[PDB]
Amino acid sequence: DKLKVVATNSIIADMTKAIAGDKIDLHSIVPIGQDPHEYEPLPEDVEKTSNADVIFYNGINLEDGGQAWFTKLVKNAQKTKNKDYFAVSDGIDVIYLEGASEKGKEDPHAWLNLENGIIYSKNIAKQLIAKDPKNKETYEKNLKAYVAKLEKLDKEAKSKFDAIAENKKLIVTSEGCFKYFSKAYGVPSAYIWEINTEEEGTPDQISSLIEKLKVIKPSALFVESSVDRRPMETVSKDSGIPIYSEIFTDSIAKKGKPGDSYYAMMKWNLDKISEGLAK
C-alpha cells in the first residue's frame, strides 16, 4: 500500500516529488496558478485529506490562520498537529509583516530563501522516513541530491546581484512576498499590497508604490504568475518602468512551462530578476 500524502500547494508538492519520487500517492490541494492564502478546498481535497497518512502545509500565515482554509480543513477532518499534518516551515527564522494593518501576523513566503526551501525539504523527508521506513533509502538519497542542487543555487543567489548599483537593487512585485529573499540575498523589495489577504491593488497602494519608484528607480518591475496583472500593469504604465518578466512566488508553473518546479522557478526568478535589474 502506497503512502498517502497531501500537500497544500504546488511548491510543497513539488518538493515532496523531489524527495519521494514514485514511492507515494501525492495530492496537491491548491492547484497551479491559484492563490494559496484564500483557495477554497473542493470535496476531492477534503476526501484525500481525511484519508492521508501525512499532510504537509506551509504554516507561518499562508493557510493556517484562525479563519483560514487549512485550519478549517484539519479541524473538520479531526487531524492532530505533528501527528497527521506538519508545517514544513518549522525551524526557520521568521520574518513578520511590517504593515500596521497586519498587526503581528507572520510573512509566509519563506521558500523564496533557498536555505528555507532546504529546511522545507528536510522536514518533508523527515516525516516521509518516519511513516514509510521501507523507502528510507530512496528518500535520503533524493533529499541529499535535492539539498545539494539547492545549495549550489543558493551560493549563486548570494552573488548574483553584485554587479548592480545599490540605487537600482529593488525587486518590485505585486505582493510583498520577497521579504525572505531580500534578507537572504541583499536585495530590498517593494510591493503594492503586502499579503494576498489585503485588498489587491487599491489606488492608494498603487500611488504609494509610484512614489516609492521615483526615489529608488529599478530598471524593471516583475509580476507573479498567481496574481491579476492589472495592478502591476498600472504601476508599469504610470511609472514607465516595463515589467521585465513573469516570476514565480506562490505557485510553480504549469507542467511543461519554464519554472514548473520549485528549483526551476527559483533559477527562473534568479535569472529574470538579475537580468531585469541590470537594464
Epitope: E40, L42, P43
Partner: single-chain antibody, 215 residues
Framework: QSLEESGGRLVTPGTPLTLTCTAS????????MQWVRQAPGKGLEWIGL?????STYYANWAKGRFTISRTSTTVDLKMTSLTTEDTATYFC????????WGQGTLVTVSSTQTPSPVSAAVGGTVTISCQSS????????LSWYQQKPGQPPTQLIG???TLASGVPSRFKGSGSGTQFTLTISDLESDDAATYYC??????????FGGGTELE
C-alpha cells in the same frame, strides 16, 4: 457582493441557449462557481461547477448537454439542446459552499441525498430537518440552505456544523458520514421556508436533497 444571471428566455425544444452569470463587486478568478437549477415548484438541482483553476464537473444526468466556461467577470452555462424537463430557474452560486447566489434567470421550454420529511411545523419551538445520504461525503461536506419563496437560497450552515456569517446559533447542524440533521430552535414566523441540503462527494460532485418546508 452581487451575482446577476441573464440570458434566460422561453424557447422551443431543441433550442440551444447560453446563460451568463455576471459578477459585480468582486472577481471570479479566485472563486468556484456552481450552476444550480430549480424547476417551478420542484426543488433545487445541481448542474455543475467550474473550479477557480478551470476544472469542470457536472452531474451524471448532464450527458454533456450543459457546458460551463469562465472569464474574469462572467461564468457561462452553454445549454446545447433544451427539453421541456429543462424548464427551471437557473442560479449561479459562488464557492464550494455556495455562499451567495444570484437572483436567477428563468428558462421556459414549451410546445443522491433524501431528506426524510417533506414538511414540518411548530409555532415558537423546535423543528428537525433530517438527511440520509447513500454514500459518505468526505464525512463533513454537508451544507444547509434556507429558501424563502421567490428568492435565492441563503446558506445557513457549511461543513455540517459551522455557521455562516450572521446566522444565529439558533440554527444547529449535526451529523457525520451519511446522516445529517438541521435543528431550528426558538422558531419564528419568518423561519417559514423550504430548507434544502447540499452534499459534496468524491469526484467533486454536489447533490441537493429534496425540499423540507417549514411552518
Amino acid at each position: 457582493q452581487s451575482l446577476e444571471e441573464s440570458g434566460g428566455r422561453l424557447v422551443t425544444p431543441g433550442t440551444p441557449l447560453t446563460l451568463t452569470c455576471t459578477a459585480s463587486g468582486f472577481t471570479i478568478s479566485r472563486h468556484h462557481m456552481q450552476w444550480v437549477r430549480q424547476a417551478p415548484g420542484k426543488g433545487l438541482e445541481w448542474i455543475g461547477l467550474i473550479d477557480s483553476s478551470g476544472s469542470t464537473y457536472y452531474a451524471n444526468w448532464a450527458k454533456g448537454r450543459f457546458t460551463i466556461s469562465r472569464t474574469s467577470t462572467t461564468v457561462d452555462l452553454k445549454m446545447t439542446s433544451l427539453t421541456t424537463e429543462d424548464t427551471a430557474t437557473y442560479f449561479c452560486a459562488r464557492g464550494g459552499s455556495m455562499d451567495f447566489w444570484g437572483q436567477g434567470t428563468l428558462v421556459t421550454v414549451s410546445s443522491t441525498q433524501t431528506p426524510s420529511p417533506v414538511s414540518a411545523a411548530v409555532g415558537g419551538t423546535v423543528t428537525i430537518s433530517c438527511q440520509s445520504s447513500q454514500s459518505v461525503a468526505g464525512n463533513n461536506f454537508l451544507s444547509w440552505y434556507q429558501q424563502k419563496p421567490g428568492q435565492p437560497p441563503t446558506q445557513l450552515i457549511g461543513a455540517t456544523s459551522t455557521l455562516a456569517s450572521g446566522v444565529p446559533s439558533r440554527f444547529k447542524g449535526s451529523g457525520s458520514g451519511t446522516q445529517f440533521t438541521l435543528t431550528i430552535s426558538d422558531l419564528e414566523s419568518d423561519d417559514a421556508a423550504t430548507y434544502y441540503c447540499a452534499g459534496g462527494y468524491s469526484g467533486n460532485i454536489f447533490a441537493f436533497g429534496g425540499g423540507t418546508e417549514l411552518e
